[PDB]
Design a protein around this ligand. Structure first.
Ligand SMILES: *[C@@H]1O[C@H](CO)[C@@H](O)[C@H](O)[C@H]1NC(C)=O
Ligand SMILES: *[C@@H]1O[C@H](CO)[C@@H](O)[C@H](O)[C@H]1NC(C)=O
Ligand SMILES: *[C@@H]1O[C@H](CO)[C@@H](O)[C@H](O)[C@H]1NC(C)=O
Ligand SMILES: *[C@@H]1O[C@H](CO)[C@@H](O)[C@H](O)[C@H]1NC(C)=O
Ligand SMILES: *[C@](C)(O)CCC[N+](C)(C)C
Ligand SMILES: *[C@](C)(O)CCC[N+](C)(C)C
Ligand SMILES: C[C@H](O)CCC[N+](C)(C)C
Ligand SMILES: C[C@H](O)CCC[N+](C)(C)C
Ligand SMILES: [Cl-]
Ligand SMILES: [Cl-]
Ligand SMILES: [Cl-]
Ligand SMILES: [Cl-]
Lengths: 532, 528
């Protein structure tokens, strides 16, 4: 029976799912950990203990407890990212799509959803893995992990809420793939982990953590890297925020045991309701509970590890989208609106920069402002909007990633960099937002291949080439098929630093993705803020 | 006689000079002060005591003692700025050009040579005032003033070497024009002072100083302003350099009088030989003995005076040239040469900025570097050369001048700004240097009008419209006679290009870079 598979933890029964006139096997909602509920909250995950009988894996699992975006009720553009299943702390499950007939020992790709480490689900429609698994004939896994306080509350020293448990949930799912994927036709020796945003930062964190390294072969990072300013905090900041969450709930702060005990007595939604109150400053692209540099999951500072080459050395394929910052400006910066061209006055521009770089001193602010202001036309509402868009995206995504690619490449065994700049013809968001953070995902999962979604013929072709690039990279460590005819995606080298645009037009090779601004963000600004 | 004039100090006999197939009156080397020699060295100037008989004013006077540029012997490009006659401490004289027949109460223009306060002469060929005086019919006066230690050694507190005597010499010459120009047909109530580089900074300083305000009507500043970083120093820095000058010459440093008496015994060239050793850093566009903010000639700091509006309120006309920095890079920065394109390597670029902003810390240097480096092509030699060229010019001339123009305009009564970007066709310097610092002067003085100089017809026309803009401005406060040179206003901040093509109006001259040099860097250096 193609649909009946017995794993190290027990039997599982999948379901036959239709896909583009054909069919594939799907194993949805398989548990990989014990429900981190009750006294398990904030605690490191524990392996799912063996069960008897056949586990029904024909339906999606619950999504983890998280903040839900209600800015635009009914609007598909935002709701497509909200939980589409009931939320529950009992959410540590994974989904698998296996080609039919079952391959023998084929390439495996594991998906790690993003969502700022405070949200995300493995069950969104945009993550349906049937199209990719079917078209590229790979075994596609979709994992999950605790987000927000439930997954990253950090009180260093304690073993009840040590921090990074969300990252540990991911590792456990990878350990599960390593031990049972062979039973689904996949080769545990050829697994590629890929994710976007927080998922992309996660992938890079596994590349760094000695405890995750041997659990995968290669890695793909989309609009996210481990060194992003929003992707981690110091143990001190983590404790400070943890204590602040308690204070917000009138918790006994006399000790970690009592604080944790108090927080374990609260209902999920109670934690979530005050989640954003613990942040240091008014800001955008900043999240309360994220990974912490604990000295355990992460031996030393991320930077020192990148400089010494202390990390998995393999091949990586990463990149960013043209307008990474717009999504976040729309939600937290004045002057921005979904139903308007959002021309930003000078007053709001100033406010935006303060909001975008919350940790900067007045001098740092002036520096950012001067670096992104055309003083021959400072009141230009459009230049001010786009300026802010670039500030947010360069600071939070692009430059941190460029820093990462340059450091990694000095020790790695293969780097391929991309710049996704295609505005989908059917985008529901306003034109000013451009190529939005997260909108390359639908192309990666082949949504353009389904006719009723109304993508253009050229968008279907773009999707097919991106999927083939991803899959081929997963299988061999090179997105290009040797001795093939199509244009070749060149390797990123420390000297030439090449990268390609990713759109519907013929390939174009560029060099030094946004070096000017990134030199500012990665070299000059830090030195300025470090002075006094 | 048309050539015999009785001044309040005595009679002077001029000389009839030829000019563009015609003639005009010339009075050369008229003494306006007592020879500041011997015990008068470093001391404020004293008015020239009356003389009997007729003073021979038919030939140029001596040039003040100064460092002489011997970098390119025989090369006319560097030599045209060197003293063209005997140097002597007895050099306080002035020259006048009067149109023939002698006009009545006509407009006067007083020229103040530049030279970084360490050099310059009123006798240079390019300062020949006959062309401008004749063509525009104005009485043209060129004055002189002590430069170097002789004119600016500052030992605040002492009255033997109080500092700023060079500026005081300029003042006495203006005071002399105020009392005697009418006798040459000049109108003392309509006097315009104009100068280039250090000459422009001087003009600016007179606009600021109370004791100078009533000695002129309007002002013109060419490639120089009072607030330039090389134009002045604190009393503390002036004293330090003064003491260090003595040290270099093994002087008794126990007290001011002992220090001064020692320095007064040395021969001129002994002082000049060690002049540069007193600078605090290795650098370019930096000079040893310059004006001092003494609380006397300058009531308070230049900036505070500019904010409170404490200065002469009138009409000003000022501008800069496209490539102000090339000249100084050629002389003190590695990688530059007069006989090559001078592509600057990356290492030399680094060295260059350090030399350009000697006072900046490492963060400041990184800031200047990032601000002027295209990181998509950092190893481009031409881009590094031009970048260094803009750094030196933006920091030392253009931006300090824009800061001055914006501050002045708030209280002034009329501002006219220009951007001179014409590359002379017969220029002897290499092309990489572009529109060099000081090369608009030949156009202001009508040199293109003389055939033998081989300028193009378009350049002659350019020179004529420039002389007319200058002269018309001097006589009415507006370079336009009733394409119009728009007025620079706080709001629109307009300015015009000055070249051989039809006039073009622009706004916010190099505002991007100047925002960096006038607001961000200062703030960054004060914070770190
Ligand atoms: C598994 O669940 C699906 C969906 O609820 C259902 O159709 C199927 O019959 C179930 N299988 C069994 C026998 O539990
Ligand atoms: C990757 O490693 C292999 C084996 O050491 C080496 O032969 C190859 O050149 C490397 N490739 C790259 C792009 O570094
Ligand atoms: C003035 O001096 C010049 C040159 O020394 C001489 O030619 C001239 O005759 C003198 N003036 C007169 C006429 O006495
Ligand atoms: C100059 O002053 C006069 C009289 O005070 C005034 O009418 C005129 O507007 C002023 N000009 C400018 C442009 O400031
Ligand atoms: C990233 C910070 O994890 C943000 C991800 C956001 N969505 C909307 C693309 C899921
Ligand atoms: C200014 C610093 O006074 C420099 C002027 C230099 N010349 C060569 C034009 C006289
Ligand atoms: C990115 C994002 O929507 C932030 C969450 C919104 N607040 C802070 C208003 C709850
Ligand atoms: C441009 C100029 O003559 C600079 C002065 C040269 N040194 C420093 C050698 C005396
Ligand atoms: Cl970088
Ligand atoms: Cl002649
Ligand atoms: Cl001689
Ligand atoms: Cl105004």
């Amino acid at each position: 029976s193609e649909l009946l598979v017995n794993t190290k933890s027990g039997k599982v029964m999948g379901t036959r799912v239709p896909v583009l006139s054909s069919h594939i096997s799907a194993f949805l909602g398989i548990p990989f950990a014990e429900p981190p509920v009750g006294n398990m909250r904030f605690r490191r995950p524990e392996p799912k203990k063996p069960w008897s009988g056949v586990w029904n894996a024909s339906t999606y699992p619950n999504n983890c407890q998280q903040y839900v975006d209600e800015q635009f009720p009914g609007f598909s553009g935002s709701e497509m990212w909200n939980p589409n299943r009931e939320m529950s702390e009992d959410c540590l499950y994974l989904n698998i799509w296996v080609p039919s007939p079952r391959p023998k020992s084929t390439t495996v790709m594991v998906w790690i959803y993003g969502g700022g480490f405070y949200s995300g689900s493995s069950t969104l429609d945009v993550y349906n893995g049937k199209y990719l698994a079917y078209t590229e004939e790979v075994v596609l896994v979709s994992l999950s992990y605790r987000v927000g306080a439930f997954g990253f509350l950090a009180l260093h020293g304690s073993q009840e809420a040590p921090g990074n448990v969300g990252l540990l949930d991911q590792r456990m799912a990878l350990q599960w793939v390593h031990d049972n994927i062979q039973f689904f036709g996949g080769d545990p020796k050829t697994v590629t982990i890929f994710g976007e945003s927080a998922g992309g930062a996660s992938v890079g964190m596994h590349i760094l953590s000695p405890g995750s390294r041997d659990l995968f072969r290669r890695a793909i990072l989309q609009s996210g890297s481990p060194n992003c300013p929003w992707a981690s905090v110091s143990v001190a900041e983590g404790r400070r925020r943890a204590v602040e969450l308690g204070r917000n709930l009138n918790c006994n702060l006399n000790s970690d045991e009592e604080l944790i005990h108090c927080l374990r007595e609260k209902k999920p939604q109670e934690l979530i309701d005050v989640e954003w109150n613990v942040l240091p400053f008014d800001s955008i692209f900043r999240f309360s509970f994220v990974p912490v540099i604990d000295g355990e999951f992460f031996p030393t500072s991320l930077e020192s590890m990148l400089n010494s080459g202390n990390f998995k050395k393999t091949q990586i394929l990463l990149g960013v989208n043209k307008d990474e910052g717009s999504f976040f400006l729309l939600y937290g910066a004045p002057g921005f609106s979904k139903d308007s061209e959002s021309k930003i006055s000078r007053e709001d521009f100033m406010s935006g920069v303060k909001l975008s770089v919350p940790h900067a001193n007045d001098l740092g602010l002036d520096a950012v402002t001067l670096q992104y202001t055309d003083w021959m036309d400072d009141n230009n509402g459009i230049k001010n909007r786009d300026g802010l868009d670039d500030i947010v995206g360069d600071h939070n995504v692009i430059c941190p990633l460029m820093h990462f690619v340059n450091k990694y490449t000095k020790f790695g065994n293969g780097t391929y960099l991309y710049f996704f700049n295609h505005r989908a013809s059917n985008l529901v968001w306003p034109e000013w937002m451009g190529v939005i953070h997260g909108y390359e995902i639908e192309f990666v999962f082949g949504l353009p291949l389904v006719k009723e979604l109304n993508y253009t013929a050229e968008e279907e072709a773009l999707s097919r080439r991106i999927m083939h690039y991803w899959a081929t990279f997963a299988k061999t460590g090179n997105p290009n098929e040797p001795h093939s005819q199509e244009s070749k995606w060149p390797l990123f080298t420390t000297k030439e630093q090449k990268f390609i645009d990713l759109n519907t037009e013929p390939m174009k090779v560029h060099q030094r993705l946004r070096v000017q601004m990134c030199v500012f963000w990665n070299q000059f600004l830090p030195k300025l803020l470090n002075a006094t």
